[PDB]
Structure 1
Amino acid sequence: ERAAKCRAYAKALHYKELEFQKGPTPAILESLISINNKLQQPEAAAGVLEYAMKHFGELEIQATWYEKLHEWEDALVAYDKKMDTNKDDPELMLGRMRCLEALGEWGQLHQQCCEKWTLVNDETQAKMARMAAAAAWGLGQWDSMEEYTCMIPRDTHDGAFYRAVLALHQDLFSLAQQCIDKARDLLDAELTAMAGESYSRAYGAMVSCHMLSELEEVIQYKLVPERREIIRQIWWERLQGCQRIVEDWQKILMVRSLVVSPHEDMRTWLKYASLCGKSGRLALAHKTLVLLLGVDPSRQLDHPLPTVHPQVTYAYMKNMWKSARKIDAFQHMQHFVQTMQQQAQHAIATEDQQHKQELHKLMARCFLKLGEWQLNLQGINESTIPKVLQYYSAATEHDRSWYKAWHAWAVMNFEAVLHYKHQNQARDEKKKVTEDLSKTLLMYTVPAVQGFFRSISLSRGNNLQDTLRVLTLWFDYGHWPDVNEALVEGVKAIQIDTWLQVIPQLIARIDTPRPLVGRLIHQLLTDIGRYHPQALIYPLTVASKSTTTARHNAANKILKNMCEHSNTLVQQAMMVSEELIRVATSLELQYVSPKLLMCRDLELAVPGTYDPNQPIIRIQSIAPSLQVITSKQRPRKLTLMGSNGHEFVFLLKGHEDLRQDERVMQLFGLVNTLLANDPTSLRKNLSIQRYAVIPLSTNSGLIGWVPHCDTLHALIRDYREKKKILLNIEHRIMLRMAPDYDHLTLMQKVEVFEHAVNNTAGDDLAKLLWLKSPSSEVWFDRRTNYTRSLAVMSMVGYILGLGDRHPSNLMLDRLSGKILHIDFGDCFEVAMTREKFPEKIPFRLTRMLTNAMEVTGLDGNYRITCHTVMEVLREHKDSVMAVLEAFVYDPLLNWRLMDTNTALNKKAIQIINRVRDKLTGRDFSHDDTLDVPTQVELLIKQATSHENLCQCYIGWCPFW
């Protein structure tokens, strides 16, 4: 019955949205935020309010708008302006207060309550009490609470609750016991009264039911003394676990405040204060901290800080940094660290070793901020370089383990190198020059290498960035002994696994002209041969049949070496990739390649299915028939049978260098991990459907066939033919109007373009996805999926510079809805830079895409998902840049940038800057460093502009 209630909603939402289509009315708009709420789609509904604002300033008072937008801090200052310019107005005061109770502003909420007590209104008098109870509860003042509670009806969930709290202070446990169960039922029955159309009160019912069950443990915490540890554990664990915006946690802790004071909680409140900063309530976090210190909001500003609680101070100081005062913050840190080593070296009389180590760990985490801040305030130059390296090395000492510490040191060292390499390129633009540079670079290079290595070993699983960074220093440094020793030392130390991530990069340099570099690679690859042969054969096989002599030569030496322990695997894989190149409306295997029909029960793993952790699935049998996909390149629909039993379908492409597609699928892999690790992105299932890419030569290669998918172009062509609509009708429309369309001025083009849109249906996609759906909660979910997955690939695609996104280059999963990108030819601006028909667009946000989303589309799920995704990216911009750098400066893959014709070092540099700009918000204006939502808005604007879409090559179907 539960999953049966949402179906009626989903269906009515469809007609409700189809109604909005016919005419946007505040009547519908109301019934829309409601139904999107019962359907527990908070953001899609938030979108409906965004539209409600930008079209109807009619529910009026910009303070009521900020209040509905849960921007309480904005609505408060808007209500002051609305009260100081107006009068008393009983309504304006209620809001002025609701802001205060949301903000945890008990001081002002209690003052505003008492100092204004004429309140001739009885409803004003009734609401008043609910709030002034919580305000009094926060301020301690329990006499004020019971006064205001004795005004709250015992018929309300609120009235029944506040008694349970007053009983718990006055130690009336049986009273408190019953009041909870009665408040539960007054809330349970209230969740049926407004059964659907409520605020974040359905999600705040969780906040009240959470607190009530917590208040039943605060009950457990009064007479019979056994569970103090058990209760504090569940309190602590279901807090790191729990995730609820500031406001709720205030109240949640206020329940825990009835028993455990902040001074005993300590870690509990610091974790809370930590969130208040990270969310953006510094004024609140400060007060939390001032309380824990038992010392001033440092009103004595010139004075040093209290060392009494080392952790609290560190918190205060990092809050001070994220706050305004940050030369002041830095300063307090230099001194704090100095006070801390003294309080260690001296105060530690052996019998204190736990305190010693935690004091040493806090210090490390202090130094890492010190170096972080020094770089922030000063940048990288001859003065700060040895200072921060000082701070980091010092952090490396006090924690020994800890990824960040070693990582930071490595990067700083690696950027010490870059600083001078780039400073000497500056000099040579206008003998003892190279000698000092040699000593300069060898100075920072070696420790960087060392750092990256001990950083990697502390990262197992997630170390792609650092692993790649090792390879930059490695490959890039035509080897002077010192560097090579550290590299050899690391390779010995670090696990073999590490290197699997990085195999295509290693292979891209088998034929390294530098003598000392080559040797290690070859040796490393051969060890990666002894264990994990499989992750090597396919790529090594390809390399071994290379026109470039030194490649295939060196490639063979390793294959030879691998026969000494895995011969037939090399042998099988040798032949299987040989026959597949030969093969590259149907083809029977018995005519085309008999050796393949011959194959049974091989030990060769099904292309791109090998990974440790997972039982090897091997090619058991190759299906005798391959469909020939009719195209200009006639790809094949090869299909293999697995040693598990499952089938594995592939696309054998003939004249397409699949190596680029590979590094992209790699980049996507990374991006997927990043989104799986940001809480919100994981909360919303944000991902990119990827697929397997197994290059077979420079000509050919295999591609994983994503099941259940049709090109955007397919779904339309079917719908159009079903509904008797001419496939290219917008097209025929344009030419009938303007036979020379392609030659018109921008102004002239826009008209013709607009004409076509105004005389064709923009639903199609939207509409066929409705008919496709077997139900409507399936329909709704498939939409929610589609919307997100697309915004994901919009942002990522932009950073990649992913051009050429026409209706045959993206497709839709007909079972999840999630969108999927294929054909990664045009990467980086490339498509925009071209001579004939330059793409102005950043990513495809065509009309029928916009239209398949919820109405209120771009405001709702899409845009929100856009900054969430873009957010992640800008944070982890270094990892993203490691990958991208790793195939822009890649030797074999530079051929897709000298195509600006139809040395390269200079071009490659730009391409990479261009990406950094995109990840530091300098992608538009040179000088402004635009924040996420702005940049996102700017981009959505750019993707939507008729002036941009009309200029698109007609194939791109800028009207689909």
Structure 2
Amino acid sequence: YAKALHYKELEFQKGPTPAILESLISINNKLQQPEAAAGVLEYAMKHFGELEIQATWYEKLHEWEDALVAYDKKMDTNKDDPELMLGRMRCLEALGEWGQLHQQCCEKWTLVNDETQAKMARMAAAAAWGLGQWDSMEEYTCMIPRDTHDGAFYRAVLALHQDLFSLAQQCIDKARDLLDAELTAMAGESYSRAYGAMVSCHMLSELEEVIQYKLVPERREIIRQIWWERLQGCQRIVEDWQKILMVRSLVVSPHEDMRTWLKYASLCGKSGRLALAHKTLVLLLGVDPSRQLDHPLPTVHPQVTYAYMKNMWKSARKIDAFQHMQHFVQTMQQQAQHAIATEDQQHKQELHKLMARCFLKLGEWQLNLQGINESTIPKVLQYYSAATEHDRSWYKAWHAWAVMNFEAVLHYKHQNQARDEKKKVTEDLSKTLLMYTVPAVQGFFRSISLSRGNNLQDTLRVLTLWFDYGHWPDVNEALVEGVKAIQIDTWLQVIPQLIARIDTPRPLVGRLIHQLLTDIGRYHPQALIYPLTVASKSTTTARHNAANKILKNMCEHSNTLVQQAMMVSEELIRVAILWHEMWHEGLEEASRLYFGERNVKGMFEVLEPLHAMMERGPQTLKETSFNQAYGRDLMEAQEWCRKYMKSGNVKDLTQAWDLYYHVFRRISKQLPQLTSLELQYVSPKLLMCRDLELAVPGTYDPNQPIIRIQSIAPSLQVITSKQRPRKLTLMGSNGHEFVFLLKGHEDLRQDERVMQLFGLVNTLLANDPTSLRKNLSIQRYAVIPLSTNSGLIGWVPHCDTLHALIRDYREKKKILLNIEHRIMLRMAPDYDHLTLMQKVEVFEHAVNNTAGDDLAKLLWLKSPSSEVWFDRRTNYTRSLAVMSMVGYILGLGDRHPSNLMLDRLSGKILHIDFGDCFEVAMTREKFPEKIPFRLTRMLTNAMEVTGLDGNYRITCHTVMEVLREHKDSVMAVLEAFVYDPLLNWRLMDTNTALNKKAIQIINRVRDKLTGRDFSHDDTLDVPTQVELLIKQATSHENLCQCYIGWCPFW
């Protein structure tokens, strides 16, 4: 069907007919793709209202609810239809409502023909099963053939109800035997069809288990156990699980198994049926459908009760929930203290952890209902603290506690700022803030002690506090102590934000910082060698001072490693920039400065350190040669500069800049003369390096043996660009090559922090079962800063930029690469100068007159076959969406076709150039962007036909959900480097304090997370916000204004 799908859908592109739409979701169905079908439906609906089933549609869509509403709409208008009846019935039998099904069958027994009757009997059996009328079941049993599996199956059902054993066993074995050859036929269907009859064998072996349970009183616990495990074991939607369980119910009543029906009900509610789970709660509690609502809830089964409680929360009324919760906790501490005899310490502990979940939900709900003010702070403090008492090991509890202290600190600081906007104030503020500060630190730290591998939010909190308020004595106490308790691994994670603050003026902080970085220096130094070598070279002196201090502290053990680190790093910064380019940019800059801006001072300033670099002397061959050719003219122009220093005569200056212009237009002819570099010429020292103990950049993680550089490849390929990067490659101790982009004049810190963020989000999706289910991920690369200008980027194998491959299809099929652009300017020469309307008309001209089929068509040709084709297309879709969402959250602007690239094999996509962050993109002056990220019609068409509402949008939902869920941590990581000392520069470039603007940023982010981004008043659910977002990245008005090299039309 991979192949059949292609012809099907292009046949669809010829034209969109319902006959195609029915042949669509089908091939969707047995190619098993669930969501894409949902797409077929979606488009079919937004355009064609012909219907002619919406019911078979919803049914094969596994949505029964809308299917029923549709089927009644179809049946009431029409006559009585044997088929429509059957369909309307399937909706109910999957729904799990027997009460309607039995009636609906017996209400008309006349209209059932021998074809419709046999089909009727089967479902009907299932109907009569639920009510507990075994006679209806039995009569409608004998209608169903003994040849089909379900017949001899229900036969066994009856035999076990009537306690006929031998009969039941024979029937079970035969029942297997009939369905046997069926499963043989899966063969593409793996976690797929096997599920399908995993149901059948499920029920069968379950029946073995029944005939065991009723036959003897031992195994009860063990049955309850396998049930338990494989309840947890193979997870399914509610609707199949009703049958799944009711099978099990054939012997055991709900009250023995109660845990089962409990987390089952949890599946129901967490799947969006409150009513069903409600009924289940009545059946289990023993009582209490809502009739008398004034009566507190039965404590008979504390578990069940509590379950029922958070169940009520998820409904509309939270207040009764709150009250009954308090009455229940207060009832339970009294059932605890007095009714305890020393004989059960088992009841005690579980009842207590129960009390913990209770206190926690108490606090959270106080939060939801009220919001933060003076009154709720100590209340939630107390509930949370009690939760901390009753269960000492709970990470949830300690985390909520510490988070709450932190949030109180923030509430009082923000309240203080709100008082400053309009002497005792600052003192009461100090005491209060400290008071809520220290337990924050404590709780955060202990909560971390129990984490073991996700500390991240909590750790960035620890550092936010540490850096803000840390020079207070009590807080310093808590800090050093928590430092004592904790394992040292935790801060590897936080190493970059650490080293950003090493220059901190507050002494008490700089102290514990150097101390900690030294302890971490002891074990696994490989982590701290690179960044601290980067900082070992800095303009602000304090940084490199305190740095060399700790380099010293490392030497006593690690000296060889340290020296090789510094050495290789230096050599790297050198190779990154050869002197001739240094002078190229230095002189272009200086000349621009003095002649353009009439600035002599700036010219001297940028000129001089270059001359210092000329002074220390070439240690290498290429530099020696440059010195040879241009050195005289350079030193001469320098002497003319000193002559302007002494004389004041401008002609001495024009004379210097004569030599300068000379060596410059001598160089510029050699600039794209380097497509390559040889290491013997450029850096003999690196050519020398053999079997170092230094780990390959970014390759280090605590859980695996060290991969280190064996050698460095002699040749480096320099990529042609404005920045002119180099292709570096290294050979390690493991035997594999490792490739690194060498980039001059680029700041890798932004992208470094961003990569940390994406590592986190990767973990987040690793936590969500739906995302884990769908392989949702963001491709990530190891980033290794060297200097502020220079750096190392991990190259991504098998990857081509969009623009590149576009160009490929342009020259291959021989359509002009720029042809659209050329037609734009053709009809409209002024195009960038046009009004919005003109712009748009132009754009539409361009689009109607061009096919966006490039990406998808080539990708079709890109794949070796249809199947892999499909796979790739899907992985694309998915990844695309992932970074679509995580990207709009981070606010990534300015992605031109080149600005991302496709993996060819896996197909998946990578984004780069994260130097543009947040809302900076749209706030820029010339050509501001109206776009969250590019939905442009080639990317659009690249997916399955009208792939908007298919895997794409549905996944938009998924990711967005995950984000709104984990949101606190994301805010932590964002606010971590939004306010970071060194990187605050990018927030001031909107010109062409910073506190205020950064807070604006984080406010708008929290807006994005809460759904406050679009309209401030409304709170948008995931689906609608996704709707308006996709409507924004769509509208031609937004897409037309765009920078023409950004390629909106591609």
Q: How many residues align?
A: 950
Note the C-alpha offset of 1:589: 0.3
Q: Distance in 2 between matches of 1:99 and 1:556?
A: 73
String of CA shifts for 1:155-203, please: whole Å, max 9, x gaps: 4333333222222222334433344454455545667999999999886
For the 8 Å contact 2:470–2:476, the answer to whether it is kept is no
More moved, 461-470 vs 71-80: 71-80
Check 1:212–1:480 CA distance in 2 against 1; reply closer, same or farther (3 A cut). Answer: same
Consecutive unaligned residues in structure 1, runs of 5 or more: 1-8
More moved, 94-103 vs 941-950: 94-103
Note the C-alpha offset of 1:879: 1.0
Q: Distance in 2 between matches of 1:340 and 1:96?
A: 48
Note the C-alpha offset of 1:234: 2.5
For the 8 Å contact 2:729–2:737, the answer to whether it is kept is yes
Aligned residue in 1 for 2:875: 785
User: Alignment partner of 2:492: what SS?
Assistant: helix
For the 8 Å contact 1:47–1:859, the answer to whether it is kept is yes
Q: Distance in 1 between matches of 2:141 and 2:938?
A: 55
Q: Distance in 1 between matches of 2:174 and 2:55?
A: 35
Q: Distance in 1 between matches of 2:482 and 2:194?
A: 55
For the 8 Å contact 1:479–1:517, the answer to whether it is kept is yes
More moved, 462-471 vs 211-220: 211-220
More moved, 864-873 vs 457-466: 864-873
More moved, 182-191 vs 127-136: 182-191
Note the C-alpha offset of 1:58: 2.3
Q: Distance in 1 between matches of 2:168 and 2:895?
A: 63
String of CA shifts for 1:633-680, please: whole Å, max 9, x gaps: 110101010011110000010100000010111010001111111111
Note the C-alpha offset of 1:98: 2.9
Candidates 137, 142, 149, aligned match of 1:145: 137
Check 1:210–1:776 CA distance in 2 against 1; reply closer, same or farther (3 A cut). Answer: farther
For the 8 Å contact 2:325–2:358, the answer to whether it is kept is yes
Check 1:361–1:918 CA distance in 2 against 1; reply closer, same or farther (3 A cut). Answer: same
Over the aligned positions, Cα root-mean-square deviation in angstroms equals 2.2
For the 8 Å contact 2:975–2:1002, the answer to whether it is kept is yes
Check 1:681–1:504 CA distance in 2 against 1; reply closer, same or farther (3 A cut). Answer: same
Q: Distance in 2 between matches of 1:461 and 1:198?
A: 33
Q: Distance in 2 between matches of 1:85 and 1:474?
A: 70
Paired-residue identity, %: 100
Q: Distance in 2 between matches of 1:193 and 1:212?
A: 20
For the 8 Å contact 2:725–2:743, the answer to whether it is kept is yes
Check 1:530–1:419 CA distance in 2 against 1; reply closer, same or farther (3 A cut). Answer: same
String of CA shifts for 1:286-341, please: whole Å, max 9, x gaps: 11111111112142211111111110000011101111221011110001000110
Check 1:85–1:16 CA distance in 2 against 1; reply closer, same or farther (3 A cut). Answer: closer
Note the C-alpha offset of 1:944: 1.8
Matched, 1:517 2:542: no
Q: Distance in 1 between matches of 2:419 and 2:920?
A: 31
More moved, 425-434 vs 88-97: 88-97
Check 1:733–1:834 CA distance in 2 against 1; reply closer, same or farther (3 A cut). Answer: same
Q: Distance in 2 between matches of 1:159 and 1:310?
A: 41
User: Alignment partner of 1:535: what SS?
Assistant: helix
Q: Distance in 2 between matches of 1:433 and 1:197?
A: 70
Note the C-alpha offset of 1:31: 2.0
For the 8 Å contact 2:824–2:842, the answer to whether it is kept is yes
Matched, 1:242 2:240: no
For the 8 Å contact 1:34–1:198, the answer to whether it is kept is no
Note the C-alpha offset of 1:732: 0.8
Q: Distance in 1 between matches of 2:191 and 2:125?
A: 21
More moved, 279-288 vs 254-263: 254-263
Q: Distance in 2 between matches of 1:684 and 1:65?
A: 23
For the 8 Å contact 1:792–1:866, the answer to whether it is kept is yes
String of CA shifts for 1:779-813, please: whole Å, max 9, x gaps: 11111111111011100100000011111111011
For the 8 Å contact 2:37–2:61, the answer to whether it is kept is no
String of CA shifts for 1:59-87, please: whole Å, max 9, x gaps: 34766655454333344445556666777
Q: Distance in 1 between matches of 2:95 and 2:209?
A: 26
String of CA shifts for 1:17-40, please: whole Å, max 9, x gaps: 221121112222222222222222
Check 1:41–1:163 CA distance in 2 against 1; reply closer, same or farther (3 A cut). Answer: same
For the 8 Å contact 2:186–2:193, the answer to whether it is kept is no
More moved, 390-399 vs 102-111: 102-111
Check 1:30–1:203 CA distance in 2 against 1; reply closer, same or farther (3 A cut). Answer: farther
For the 8 Å contact 1:635–1:654, the answer to whether it is kept is yes
For the 8 Å contact 1:804–1:831, the answer to whether it is kept is yes
Check 1:193–1:642 CA distance in 2 against 1; reply closer, same or farther (3 A cut). Answer: closer
Normalising to structure 1: TM-score of the pair?
A: 0.96
Check 1:618–1:554 CA distance in 2 against 1; reply closer, same or farther (3 A cut). Answer: same
Q: Distance in 1 between matches of 2:177 and 2:844?
A: 58
Note the C-alpha offset of 1:404: 0.5
Q: Distance in 1 between matches of 2:189 and 2:773?
A: 24
Note the C-alpha offset of 1:146: 1.1
For the 8 Å contact 2:224–2:257, the answer to whether it is kept is no
Aligned residue in 2 for 1:934: 1024
Aligned residue in 1 for 2:622: none
String of CA shifts for 1:88-137, please: whole Å, max 9, x gaps: 66555544433332222222323333345454655554443222211211
For the 8 Å contact 2:777–2:879, the answer to whether it is kept is yes
Q: Distance in 1 between matches of 2:140 and 2:190?
A: 25
Q: Distance in 2 between matches of 1:90 and 1:772?
A: 49
The aligned runs of 1:205-244 (5 Å cut-off) are 205-223=197-215, 228-244=220-236
String of CA shifts for 1:318-370, please: whole Å, max 9, x gaps: 10111122101111000100011001101110101000000000000000000
Normalising to structure 2: TM-score of the pair?
A: 0.88
Note the C-alpha offset of 1:854: 1.1
More moved, 748-757 vs 140-149: 140-149
Check 1:185–1:15 CA distance in 2 against 1; reply closer, same or farther (3 A cut). Answer: farther
Note the C-alpha offset of 1:243: 1.5
Aligned residue in 2 for 1:28: 20
Q: Distance in 2 between matches of 1:893 and 1:22?
A: 52
Note the C-alpha offset of 1:241: 2.5
User: Alignment partner of 2:934: what SS?
Assistant: coil
Note the C-alpha offset of 1:913: 1.1
User: Alignment partner of 1:608: what SS?
Assistant: coil
Aligned residue in 2 for 1:636: 726
User: Alignment partner of 2:780: what SS?
Assistant: coil
Check 1:602–1:194 CA distance in 2 against 1; reply closer, same or farther (3 A cut). Answer: closer
Q: Distance in 2 between matches of 1:88 and 1:294?
A: 42
User: Alignment partner of 1:955: what SS?
Assistant: coil
For the 8 Å contact 1:389–1:412, the answer to whether it is kept is yes
Q: Distance in 2 between matches of 1:129 and 1:196?
A: 31
User: Alignment partner of 2:289: what SS?
Assistant: coil
Note the C-alpha offset of 1:550: 1.1
For the 8 Å contact 1:606–1:617, the answer to whether it is kept is yes
String of CA shifts for 1:431-454, please: whole Å, max 9, x gaps: 011111111111110111111001
More moved, 120-129 vs 283-292: 120-129
Q: Distance in 2 between matches of 1:462 and 1:195?
A: 40
Q: Distance in 1 between matches of 2:47 and 2:166?
A: 54
User: Alignment partner of 2:696: what SS?
Assistant: coil
Consecutive unaligned residues in structure 2, runs of 5 or more: 575-674
Aligned residue in 2 for 1:719: 809
Note the C-alpha offset of 1:555: 1.2
Aligned residue in 1 for 2:716: 626
Q: Distance in 2 between matches of 1:749 and 1:890?
A: 40
Q: Distance in 1 between matches of 2:476 and 2:767?
A: 35
Matched, 1:491 2:460: no
Note the C-alpha offset of 1:229: 4.5
Check 1:766–1:643 CA distance in 2 against 1; reply closer, same or farther (3 A cut). Answer: same
Q: Distance in 2 between matches of 1:857 and 1:800?
A: 24
For the 8 Å contact 1:35–1:196, the answer to whether it is kept is no
Check 1:258–1:641 CA distance in 2 against 1; reply closer, same or farther (3 A cut). Answer: same
Candidates 675, 691, 701, aligned match of 1:601: 691
More moved, 230-239 vs 822-831: 230-239
Check 1:64–1:773 CA distance in 2 against 1; reply closer, same or farther (3 A cut). Answer: closer
Note the C-alpha offset of 1:245: 0.7
Check 1:497–1:120 CA distance in 2 against 1; reply closer, same or farther (3 A cut). Answer: closer
String of CA shifts for 1:241-267, please: whole Å, max 9, x gaps: 221111111111111112332111111
Note the C-alpha offset of 1:572: 0.6
Q: Distance in 2 between matches of 1:173 and 1:942?
A: 66
For the 8 Å contact 1:218–1:255, the answer to whether it is kept is no
Check 1:199–1:128 CA distance in 2 against 1; reply closer, same or farther (3 A cut). Answer: farther
